[PDB]
Amino acid sequence: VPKWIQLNNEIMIQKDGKFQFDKDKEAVHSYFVDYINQNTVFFHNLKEKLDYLVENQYYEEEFLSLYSFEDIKEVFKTAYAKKFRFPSFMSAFKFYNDYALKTNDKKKILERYEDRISIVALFFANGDTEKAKEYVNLMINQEYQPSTPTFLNAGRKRRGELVSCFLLEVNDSLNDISRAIDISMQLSKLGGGVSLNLSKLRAKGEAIKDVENATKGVVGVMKLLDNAFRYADQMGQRQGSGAAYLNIFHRDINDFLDTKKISADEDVRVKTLSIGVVIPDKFVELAREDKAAYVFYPHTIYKEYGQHMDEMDMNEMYDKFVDNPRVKKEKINPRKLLEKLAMLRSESGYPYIMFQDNVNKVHANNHISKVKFSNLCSEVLQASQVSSYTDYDEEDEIGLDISCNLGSLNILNVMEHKSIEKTVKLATDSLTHVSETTDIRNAPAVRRANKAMKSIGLGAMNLHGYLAQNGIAYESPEARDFANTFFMMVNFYSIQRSAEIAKEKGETFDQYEGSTYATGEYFDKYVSTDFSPKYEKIANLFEGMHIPTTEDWKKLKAFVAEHGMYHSYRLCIAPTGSISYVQSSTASVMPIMERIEERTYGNSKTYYPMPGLASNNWFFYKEAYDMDMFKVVDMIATIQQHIDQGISFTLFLKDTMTTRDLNRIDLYAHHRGIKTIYYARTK
Amino acid sequence: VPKWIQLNNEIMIQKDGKFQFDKDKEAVHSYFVDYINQNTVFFHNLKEKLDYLVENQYYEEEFLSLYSFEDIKEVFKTAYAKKFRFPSFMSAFKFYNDYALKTNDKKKILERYEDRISIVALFFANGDTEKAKEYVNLMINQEYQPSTPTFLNAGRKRRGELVSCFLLEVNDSLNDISRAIDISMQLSKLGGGVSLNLSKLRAKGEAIKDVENATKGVVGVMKLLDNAFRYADQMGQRQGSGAAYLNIFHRDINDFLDTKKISADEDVRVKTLSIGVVIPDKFVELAREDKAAYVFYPHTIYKEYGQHMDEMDMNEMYDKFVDNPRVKKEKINPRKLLEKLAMLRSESGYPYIMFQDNVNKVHANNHISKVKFSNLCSEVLQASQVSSYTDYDEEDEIGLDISCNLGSLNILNVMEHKSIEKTVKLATDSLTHVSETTDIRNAPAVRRANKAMKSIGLGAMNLHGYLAQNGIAYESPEARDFANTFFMMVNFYSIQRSAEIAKEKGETFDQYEGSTYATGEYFDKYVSTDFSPKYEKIANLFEGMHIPTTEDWKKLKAFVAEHGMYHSYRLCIAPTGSISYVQSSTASVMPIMERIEERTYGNSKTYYPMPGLASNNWFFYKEAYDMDMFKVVDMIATIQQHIDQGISFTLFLKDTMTTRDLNRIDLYAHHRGIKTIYYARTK
Amino acid sequence: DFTQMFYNQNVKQFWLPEEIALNGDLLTWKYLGKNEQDTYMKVLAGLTLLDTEQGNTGMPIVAEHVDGHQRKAVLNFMAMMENAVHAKSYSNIFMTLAPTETINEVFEWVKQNKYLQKKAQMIVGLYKAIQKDDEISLFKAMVASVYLESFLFYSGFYYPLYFYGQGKLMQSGEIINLILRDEAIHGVYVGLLAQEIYNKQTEEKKAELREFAIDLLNQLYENELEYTEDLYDQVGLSHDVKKFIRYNANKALMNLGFDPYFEEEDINPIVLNGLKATVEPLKDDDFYF
Amino acid sequence: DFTQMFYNQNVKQFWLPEEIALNGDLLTWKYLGKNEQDTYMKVLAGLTLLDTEQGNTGMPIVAEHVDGHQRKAVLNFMAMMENAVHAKSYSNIFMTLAPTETINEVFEWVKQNKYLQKKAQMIVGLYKAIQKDDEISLFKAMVASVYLESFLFYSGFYYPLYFYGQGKLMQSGEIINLILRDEAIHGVYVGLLAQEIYNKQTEEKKAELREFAIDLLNQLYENELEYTEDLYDQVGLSHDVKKFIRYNANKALMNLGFDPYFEEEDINPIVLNGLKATVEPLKDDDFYF
Ligand SMILES: Nc1ncnc2c1ncn2[C@@H]1O[C@H](COP(=O)(O)OP(=O)(O)OP(=O)(O)O)[C@@H](O)[C@H]1O
Ligand SMILES: Nc1ncnc2c1ncn2[C@@H]1O[C@H](COP(=O)(O)OP(=O)(O)OP(=O)(O)O)[C@@H](O)[C@H]1O
Ligand SMILES: Cc1cn([C@H]2C[C@H](O)[C@@H](COP(=O)(O)OP(=O)(O)OP(=O)(O)O)O2)c(=O)[nH]c1=O
Ligand SMILES: [Mg+2]
Numbered sequence A, B: 001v002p003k004w005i006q007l008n009n010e011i012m013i014q015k016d017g018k019f020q021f022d023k024d025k026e027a028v029h030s031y032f033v034d035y036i037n038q039n040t041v042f043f044h045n046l047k048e049k050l051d052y053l054v055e056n057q058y059y060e061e062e063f064l065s066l067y068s069f070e071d072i073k074e075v076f077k078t079a080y081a082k083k084f085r086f087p088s089f090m091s092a093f094k095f096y097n098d099y100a101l102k103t104n105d106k107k108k109i110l111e112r113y114e115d116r117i118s119i120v121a122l123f124f125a126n127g128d129t130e131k132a133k134e135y136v137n138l139m140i141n142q143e144y145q146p147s148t149p150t151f152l153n154a155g156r157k158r159r160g161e162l163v164s165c166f167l168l169e170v171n172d173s174l175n176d177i178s179r180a181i182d183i184s185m186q187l188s189k190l191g192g193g194v195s196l197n198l199s200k201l202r203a204k205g206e207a208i209k210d211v212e213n214a215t216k217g218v219v220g221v222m223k224l225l226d227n228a229f230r231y232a233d234q235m236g237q238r239q240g241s242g243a244a245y246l247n248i249f250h251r252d253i254n255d256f257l258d259t260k261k262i263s264a265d266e267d268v269r270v271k272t273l274s275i276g277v278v279i280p281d282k283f284v285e286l287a288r289e290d291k292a293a294y295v296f297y298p299h300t301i302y303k304e305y306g307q308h309m310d311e312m313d314m315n316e317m318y319d320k321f322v323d324n325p326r327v328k329k330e331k332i333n334p335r336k337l338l339e340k341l342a343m344l345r346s347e348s349g350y351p352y353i354m355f356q357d358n359v360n361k362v363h364a365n366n367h368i369s370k371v372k373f374s375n376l377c378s379e380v381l382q383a384s385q386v387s388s389y390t391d392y393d394e395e396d397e398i399g400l401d402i403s404c405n406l407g408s409l410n411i412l413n414v415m416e417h418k419s420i421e422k423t424v425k426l427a428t429d430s431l432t433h434v435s436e437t438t439d440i441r442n443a444p445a446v447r448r449a450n451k452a453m454k455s456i457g458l459g460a461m462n463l464h465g466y467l468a469q470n471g472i473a474y475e476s477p478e479a480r481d482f483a484n485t486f487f488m489m490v491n492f493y494s495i496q497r498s499a500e501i502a503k504e505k506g507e508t509f510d511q512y513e514g515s516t517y518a519t520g521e522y523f524d525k526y527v528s529t530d531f532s533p534k535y536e537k538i539a540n541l542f543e544g545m546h547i548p549t550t551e552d553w554k555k556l557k558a559f560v561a562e563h564g565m566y567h568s569y570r571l572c573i574a575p576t577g578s579i580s581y582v583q584s585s586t587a588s589v590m591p592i593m594e595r596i597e598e599r600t601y602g603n604s605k606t607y608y609p610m611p612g613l614a615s616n617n618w619f620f621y622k623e624a625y626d627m628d629m630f631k632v633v634d635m636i637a638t639i640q641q642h643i644d645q646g647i648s649f650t651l652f653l654k655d656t657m658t659t660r661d662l663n664r665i666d667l668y669a670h671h672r673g674i675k676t677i678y679y680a681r682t683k
Numbered sequence C, D: 001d002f003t004q005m006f007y008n009q010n011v012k013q014f015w016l017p018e019e020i021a022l023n024g025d026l027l028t029w030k031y032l033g034k035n036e037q038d039t040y041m042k043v044l045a046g047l048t049l050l051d052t053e054q055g056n057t058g059m060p061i062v063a064e065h066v067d068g069h070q071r072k073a074v075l076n077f078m079a080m081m082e083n084a085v086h087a088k089s090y091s092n093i094f095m096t097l098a099p100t101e102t103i104n105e106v107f108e109w110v111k112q113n114k115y116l117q118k119k120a121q122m123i124v125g126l127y128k129a130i131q132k133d134d135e136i137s138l139f140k141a142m143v144a145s146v147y148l149e150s151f152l153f154y155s156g157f158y159y160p161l162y163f164y165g166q167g168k169l170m171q172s173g174e175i176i177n178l179i180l181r182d183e184a185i186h187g188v189y190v191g192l193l194a195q196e197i198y199n200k201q202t203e204e205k206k207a208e209l210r211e212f213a214i215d216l217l218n219q220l221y222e223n224e225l226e227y228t229e230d231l232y233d234q235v236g237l238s239h240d241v242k243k244f245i246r247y248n249a250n251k252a253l254m255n256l257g258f259d260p261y262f263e264e265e266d267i268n269p270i271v272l273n274g275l276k277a278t279v280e281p282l283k284d285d286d287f288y289f
């Protein structure tokens, strides 16, 4: 057992009835005195290091060639002047095991934290030394964290794509299904998580070229996609991850759900394909009134109306579908379906729940399309247009496939530096740069939507960490007040930066003129409701920072009207799995699952306390499972009212609560305006 | 139970110790006087029938519009003038259950045998009334039988494709793999059996752009193809059938074979994809000498030499592969691999065995490409060039994917009518028409190969029926002499018709100038060796027909040199599974499995005696399992010497014999020049 | 070729009575007529009584005489489901819908009922006739077992499925559907074990075993028709129940590798809505001819 | 007074080996000496044999002779655990850690090992000697079963527990602890049934039954000593294991209502350190907030 691992395991050993949290710090020192410095490759000067990394195909020549060597050296010096120290052993371990650049033999460390941050900053700035230094100060203060793809791969020649969330629309044809399989394989090859909408696909027992009972339904397509994702597994590094979304009014919805049951046969169950269910308000109304619902055959609806079932508003179309004899449908019990969803989420955490009307009643780009499905993490909610992939030697009709750009603000570090505006604007600029530098040659609709929509996702993390280190309970009304104010400022500065980029470049996102930003509707609740903190403690937390008022929001609305907005979507709160360790932050805006987490690496045990955990804030670091899920829903809705896309919202349940409690949480989330529900993790 | 069912079951009720074969005839009468005539749909005249079939989307109106109604009436009258009667109940039952056109609800019979034959003939003639009458006389005499796709689907609006088998070359890339999956689904949707050569795909543990041990090998692609064929299953009517072919020198050859082991795990086992193994002469030489062999990693060979492992001759490059340190290889025991092949064929009948050198030592189009794999029935052996399917928005390099149209001569009916020449020429014309009117819009390499190669497959059926009905034992040297003479005549007249078509159209198949037809090498054994019958009985059997001599072959060689050949490939002997029932013929050139076969249909059981089975020819209808497989190999080699493509050669084994006997049969087949071995069916 | 696959499917279908809350059935039970309640009670008792024989005798006796450790384990698992899961589930349904005195009376009636007794004793008779090391007697018992699992239960299952397909008695209908799903796989599995024995027999012995199976099916079928009229005439359903019996008889025959006996019929849509060669090394000189 | 609570405990303890991922033991296994791996394989193989016979024969036969549907349901469930869960789990462990040839060899080794054959002969002989309606033959078989559950398994259990307690082979060890947790309740339950029969006897008959139980225990014990030495001498642990089996022999006697027979000894402290969701329907009030 290594010395740093012993020093880390000494945390659980209680002295005077208290955990030895400070010992973790010592572990970090050991982890750097015994391992990191010994296995870190050192060079006589930075010029030699850069030459070795470029020549050995570690870095890219293009992004480094935009700067003189003096500017690169100045950026590296700015990164190293902070003298950044990892506060916990797990932060440094996760960085140097997951993100630090290693030799081809994987035994030496080529990149420190400062080196990786400097390289990512130089990639972000695209030739501006001052902008690169600003990015270096942003990331070394740990105010902003690029996502795992961006942080890991920026500036590296041997790399995947910087985007890892991809949403694909699948049209109801064999050509479109095969193209979707191909694109899923290509994007999993790039290292991205792929979500596919299967609602347009006709159900099982439908007609193919006017022969009856011929379609295999969406379950056969799910089997094909599951095989494709198993095959494309990042060159045998990570398990291929894919998601499939189906509307709850699709007839296959039960069989869809049956793919996640343990009792399902081998020809029914898909193991590497996550599933999500899109639930329109009509289904919730039918379940609430206990009226029996109807699941429709999509192809009959398409033949009758010329549009797909998921392309029209089910609230106004459901009665017409039911009363139409030419539309084929099957009787179901919506309450039984809700109970089945709750039971499946209890067993396996699936499916993801998308409340379609909750997403689309605040969607700014409904003119382009309504949000029909979400991503693999159930937080990307954007307009998508299906593509018509025709036969060979025939021109395809390329639509819009969602691929947003991830990046997370560290709420604790951002707010302690009183730099919400600067961090949000710099993160928006970096996300815009990464979106502009993304070029996928095997996903035509993804590339077209990236060029047109210019959608980015700016998330936040360390919400619970910040609240606990400031003596605020996550379920307290003060925490929701802080979240409201902080995320309203984040939205304000994100919109301001998007409008500034649109003014500078002279271009907005495609079909912006029809958006609620152009019409000013988006700013309605912002020009009438003041989002300043209602509690003195939160106001003192925001001291030293200008909180945008209704007049500031009116000025921003006028600015957007005059200049437009560059990004169709700006904010989405991703789970932030492993980057939260490196940043010493709690994951996403979720409450912490455990105060101290026990992990097993190799044959060794390691202990990670939550950041800033001590005896004084032990009570404020309440575990997520012990919390009331209604108050967690309230906080997530408070944040969601300022996020244009969704939030990865995992439910944290105890083994005691039943499926009725899960359904109640889901229905309260639907009532409170929650757009997506990610997971049902049972303790 | 139906009356005809009782009459057919009365065959096995012996009277005076003999089977009541004549009862079978009675059954057909019943089957027509109680079911077919009552279930048939009669019109006032042919005009109303044709109009009803045209407007109700049963028939394509284009092929019928090329004839005036008087000509169509004359063709139908020619078909009905023969007064064709089905001699056995099973012939009529199979036609009216599998090939006769029924209504949309399948409650009535719209097409008689004469109606189907007339429609197929009118489609074949393409506006020529005299040619349509010739086709009608050829098919109503049952001298020639179009394949099941062509016979069933010719002239139908709801038809599929007329091509039975498709062969795809899969290049070593994710884009090519995805395109192969798409094309396999498209062609299975069209109803054709798809064969894919996986020998170019790099083995398991190869590098995908400098990251090693990343590839899943051919087994992952096999699983993808298996799921694709499961999904595309002819709209749920016929199970999707696919074939995978791998060279025996591929490193994955064991894992490949492990897909068919009955103890294979679900993550490896493949159940809807047939497997074939391509064995060069080098492997047989290594096994014979007991020298340990080496299987190779295709990607290392491609990197070192710039060509795929199956793209070059292993007999001359195996030592270079072994001595090359930059080529990666694994040690295997070739005798152990042969024993594994024999055990697998005993257990499940797989893999198909393709003796590559036996195919390519007489292959006439080696300049275009060597034959690297076979079809799903292991009888199509043609040159194929792999396609380079590139990224989206990039032009693809379209290669040649094999596809040929099947058609079988009924040997008994052809020789009874003394019309080898006329039947062969008319069948060649019909297959040329089927190739010309075939246009597949989702398989580009298949379309290009169909347009360029113009390859057709003219098979033969009722070899054993003709031999047994003429008092010739199938294993006798007289039977092999008859096969030699008959198939030399078939080859002569097929080459003559191909050259005549090339002369009349002024065009040959692509790259004909480099073929052995153009250089005259193909005719060598035909201009030096006489293939006239060596037995007086066979010569009497061939009386009334001009058997080509060496002078006729020299004249044909000069004619080909002057005019060329329209078809790259002309003769391939398919299994002819279910259409042999309608023709009252034994399946293909294979010996009969059983004298009387008991088949269960619905809740009833039926007995089909072999065509012409009686007391005097009971022992001439020797069952295949009771026959010496070495003499069957001799027969198949004798036929194969006159067939440019392969023959679907099924091995018929007894349970008592061991895997060593199967290996001996395989090695004798390789020694005798057998190109492919189809199945190892054990009694 | 099949036991490990069936092992997997069996264990992944594991369930417990407690998982389904039954009390909400009282909200539809109270609205049924006396004849509907009477038929339901009688059908339920019929299923209960037959399933007890299968748990106490049918599955354990077959497990005893079948050779093979893995087969014995699967058979043990199936016996467990009969005794520990199914029997408790039937009891739970009864205790929810009827008071103790009513349950005792229904079981007294069904215990004396001529058509229920005829089939119960016919099946039990074949289980009692199995002789050690006699595969013919084992096969006959397996046929009886398949007929119970895949055929005889279905005159009973009809009614809960009929209600379940209409939105009535949904909790007990869910339980019945889980039970039925277990009996289906039990029937298929025992069917494969019977075919294994059948395939080891001569042609004359096979024909004799086929005659046995068809004769037994006929006896049971004629009694099922009487059983059906006795229970279902009072609620007007017998015609449709008879179609369901024949359809399931055909499934039972197919489980035993036999042809269907009855013509194909459509089923009531409400019920539908509810529903190794010897390895010898190459010796050389086999490469030369 | 006890069957219902045993029924509930048994069904709530239900598990499958596939719930435990075993690839985590790969390295600590690789690191053991050849002697240690050999003893470990053989130990688990001896356990597999015992569970094979307990599942195939012991539990089903006792179930057959014990009266009462609930008692039979518990015994049937225990039988299923023996062969469908316990015996199979050992193969999961073997298939993870060992190559096929080593697995084949250890199963061949059980067939020819004289101590393992003797203990199987003795235990299974008593199971097969049970006579219908003869409570004394049944008691004797229940004593044999308690000795298998609570004594004989323990020469085998020692080694996985010994490793678990040192933080080695902890995934395999987790499986073994689940098996041990089951056998402990199986031994208590069968012990209570045996005591029921014993308590019906005259004092003279009781005296003979104690003689039977003690003679049988001593005979099994003497054989187990030789088995223990044969397996553990190569890893240096025979004396320690012997103390453990004596400890557990006393627990078996206690399960039978008898006084401890061996004196107390200090057991290796390492070995001591080695030791669907509920568904409610949705109310109309859950849709409003
Ligand atoms: N907690 C830590 N986080 C990150 N790096 C660390 C940490 N502790 C030590 N290091 C690394 O080890 C070096 C030694 O740091 P130490 O605590 O011994 O003193 P120092 O005054 O920071 O040293 P130096 O002269 O290297 O700057 C640091 O410069 C840094 O590179
Ligand atoms: N074996 C058979 N094959 C094909 N069609 C048959 C067969 N047997 C009967 N039919 C059809 O059923 C009709 C019944 O007539 P059948 O053969 O009994 O003699 P028919 O009334 O004297 O006239 P004909 O033989 O001249 O048609 C035939 O005309 C024919 O259309
Ligand atoms: C992407 C991917 C490829 N492969 C295998 C199958 C293909 O035959 C083979 C080639 O993939 P390619 O698509 O050719 O990958 P590449 O072009 O980026 O890499 P290279 O330059 O070396 O050609 O890699 C996998 O096994 N799994 C995968 O996920
Ligand atoms: Mg279409």
Ligand SMILES: [Mg+2]
Pocket: B172, B173, B174
């Ligand atoms: Mg490539």
Ligand SMILES: [Mn+2]
Pocket: C051, C054, C081, C082, C086, C179, C183
């Ligand atoms: Mn049961």
Ligand SMILES: [Mn+2]
Pocket: C054, C082, C149, C182, C183, C186
């Ligand atoms: Mn059962």
Ligand SMILES: [Mn+2]
Pocket: D051, D054, D081, D082, D086, D087, D179, D182, D183
């Ligand atoms: Mn046990």
Ligand SMILES: [Mn+2]
Pocket: D054, D078, D082, D149, D182, D183, D186, D187
């Ligand atoms: Mn036990």
